[PDB]
Amino acid sequence: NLDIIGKRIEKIKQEHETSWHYDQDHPYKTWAYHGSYETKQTASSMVNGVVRLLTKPWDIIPMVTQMAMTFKEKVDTRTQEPKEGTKKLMKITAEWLWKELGKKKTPRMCTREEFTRKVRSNAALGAIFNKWKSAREAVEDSGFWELVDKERNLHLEGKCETCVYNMMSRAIWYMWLGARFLEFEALGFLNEDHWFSRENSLSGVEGEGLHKLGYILRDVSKKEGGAMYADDTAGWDTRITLEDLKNEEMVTNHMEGEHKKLAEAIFKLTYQNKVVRVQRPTTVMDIISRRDQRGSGQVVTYGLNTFTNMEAQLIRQMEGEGVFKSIQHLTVTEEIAVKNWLVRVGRERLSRMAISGDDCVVKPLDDRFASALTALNDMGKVRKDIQQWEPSRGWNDWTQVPFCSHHFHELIMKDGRVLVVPCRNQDELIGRARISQGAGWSLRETACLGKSYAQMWSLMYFHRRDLRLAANAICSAVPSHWVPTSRTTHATHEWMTTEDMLTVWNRVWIQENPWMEDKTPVESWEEIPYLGKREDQWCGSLIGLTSRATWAKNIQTAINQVRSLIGNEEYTDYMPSMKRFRR
Ligand SMILES: O=C1NC2(CCCC2)Nc2ccccc21
Ligand SMILES: [Zn+2]
Numbered sequence: 293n294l295d296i297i298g299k300r301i302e303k304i305k306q307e308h309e310t311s312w313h314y315d316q317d318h319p320y321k322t323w324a325y326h327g328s329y330e331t332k333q334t335a336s337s338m339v340n341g342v343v344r345l346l347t348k349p350w351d352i353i354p355m356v357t358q359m360a361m362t363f364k365e366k367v368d369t370r371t372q373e374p375k376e377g378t379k380k381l382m383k384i385t386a387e388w389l390w391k392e393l394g395k396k397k398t399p400r401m402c403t404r405e406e407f408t409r410k411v412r413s414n415a416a417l418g419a420i421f422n423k424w425k426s427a428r429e430a431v432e433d434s435g436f437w438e439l440v441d442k443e444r445n446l447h448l449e450g451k452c453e454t455c456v457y458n459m460m461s462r463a464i465w466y467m468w469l470g471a472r473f474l475e476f477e478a479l480g481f482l483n484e485d486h487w488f489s490r491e492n493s494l495s496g497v498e499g500e501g502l503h504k505l506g507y508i509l510r511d512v513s514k515k516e517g518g519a520m521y522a523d524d525t526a527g528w529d530t531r532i533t534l535e536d537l538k539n540e541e542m543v544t545n546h547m548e549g550e551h552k553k554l555a556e557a558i559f560k561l562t563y564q565n566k567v568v569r570v571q572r573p574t575t576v577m578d579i580i581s582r583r584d585q586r587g588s589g590q591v592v593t594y595g596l597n598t599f600t601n602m603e604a605q606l607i608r609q610m611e612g613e614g615v616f617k618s619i620q621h622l623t624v625t626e627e628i629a630v631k632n633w634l635v636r637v638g639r640e641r642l643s644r645m646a647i648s649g650d651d652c653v654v655k656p657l658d659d660r661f662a663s664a665l666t667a668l669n670d671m672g673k674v675r676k677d678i679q680q681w682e683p684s685r686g687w688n689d690w691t692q693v694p695f696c697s698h699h700f701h702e703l704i705m706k707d708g709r710v711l712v713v714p715c716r717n718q719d720e721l722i723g724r725a726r727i728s729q730g731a732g733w734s735l736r737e738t739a740c741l742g743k744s745y746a747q748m749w750s751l752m753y754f755h756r757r758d759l760r761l762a763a764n765a766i767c768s769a770v771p772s773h774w775v776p777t778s779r780t781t782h783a784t785h786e787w788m789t790t791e792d793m794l795t796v797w798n799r800v801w802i803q804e805n806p807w808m809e810d811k812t813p814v815e816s817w818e819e820i821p822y823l824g825k826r827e828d829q830w831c832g833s834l835i836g837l838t839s840r841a842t843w844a845k846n847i848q849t850a851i852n853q854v855r856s857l858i859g860n861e862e863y864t865d866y867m868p869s870m871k872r873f874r875r
């Protein structure tokens with residue numbers, strides 16, 4: 293308890309010595325409270341005017357327009373200790389899984405140089421404002437690195453002074469840049485060296501991209517076995533047990549020297565003991581602590597969520613196959629049965645899964661998996677939107693399975709070749725492209741973000757009539773040489789380029805596509821198919837509405853409206869790449 297966290301707590305106490313008070317009316321029940329201090333501060337979603345002016349029919353669709361407007365009764369709940377049989381299953385599986393992931397990889401420290409390069413190309417490293425303005429300036433100043441050094445040597449000594457979380461759909465634990473550095477130095481290798489690539493982890497999809505995820509699900513569907521299960525966990529990050537954090541820490545068993553000590557300190561001092569500052573309007577700042585749940589950098593969180601989800605799903609597969617009888621206790625001969633299953637078939641069983649952090653698809657050996665719920669529930673990985681002991685409902689067709697907010701279509705080109713394409717309800721896609729985050733956007737910066745959405749649509753969602761038309765309109769309305777941008781950048785964004793989008797389409801879908809045997813390039817956008825018109829409507833198309841027909845017919849007028857706002861620049865007309873504007 294206070295031996296490991298007190299020092300961090302002590303230090304915050306003194307910087308607000310004028311304000312410290314143990315509030316008697318504190319709302320915490322599962323979080324250990326410690327004190328409050330005085331602050332007074334808050335980032336709403338702003339509309340992208342370039343995208344909205346070129347998507348007029350959606351101005352009267354509430355599912356789009358409501359997205360731009362506007363549970364902590366789940367962070368403040370508790371998870372029970374798993375039974376002894378469950379703890380044994382997790383420990384054997386985790387031991388086995390780090391060894392498999394480690395066979396073709398070497399753990400190593402990430403460098404100041406690597407960290408500096410990341411900051412100088414705008415990645416989301418979840419850091420706070422204070423002594424320097426931005427991340428770019430702290431990294432170019434030697435004083436920073438001396439603070440990093442002090443903390444670094446405190447960790448080698450097994451103590452922590454400044455590694456404190458600041459809490460703020462999605463929960464992010466902002467730390468100061470220095471604490472983020474030390475996390476990256478010790479555990480960055482998991483992402484930097486692709487430990488959760490499909491080649492390395494067999495279940496993982498790190499670095500894949502939406503042009504690959506549908507082909508991966510179709511390959512899983514080809515295995516003999518039962519339904520495809522895609523059960524979401526209710527509040528995954530809140531269900532990570534202290535036993536989970538201890539099995540994750542076993543990656544340190546594969547390390548040596550300074551690295552092993554620096555990694556052991558991240559896990560012991562920051563992950564398995566947390567210090568958090570939270571804004572309460574009663575506006576004060578509460579200093580709360582707890583031992584369990586996930587609270588790490590976004591990138592480390594993705595890797596360890598993937599690890600622990602692979603572990604949980606192998607165990608659910610073991611339960612379905614009758615490898616063990618009860619979670620109450622594993623007998624000595626069950627332990628050897630479990631180890632032997634892992635050695636014998638473990639890699640085959642990993643290949644039956646697609647796992648992206650808390651998100652999974654599993655094609656088990658048979659449908660016994662559906663009612664194999666004892667280990668899953670006892671590990672705390674309770675399924676969302678279904679009663680605890682009700683058997684899972686599986687999917688009979690890989691094209692129906694949800695994964696990473698998409699489903700996937702099989703789309704046959706006029707020349708017979710097969711595309712497996714990503715898809716989701718079109719209101720969601722249009723609604724997101726109409727939103728920006730943060731202040732100080734110039735018209736040029738707003739235009740270049742619209743262009744990023746348009747090029748993503750061309751590459752990933754070309755098969756949706758409305759999005760190929762709107763993408764061509766936005767690319768016609770934004771100056772041809774202006775570079776697409778994002779302010780927040782495990783997937784490949786091939787659309788972030790000033791290269792011709794037909795050339796990028798050929799590279800992604802034909803040349804580098806390992807599922808496409810015939811490498812014959814496509815010569816025009818007219819060779820690139822759409823979904824069936826009825827399927828396009830099913831997935832949210834406005835094709836057939838009077839509003840949509842008027843928009844398509846008069847698109848030049850909309851393009852010209854945006855060009856007139858941006859001013860006298862060099863523009864290209866991309867509409868004649870479409871049959872209906874080609875005379
Ligand atoms: O566990 C995670 N789940 C998803 C949702 C589906 C893709 C991965 N997102 C994440 C992003 C950062 C960190 C963790 C996660
Ligand atoms: Zn620290």
Ligand SMILES: [Zn+2]
Nearest residue numbers: 699715716831
């Ligand atoms: Zn669809």
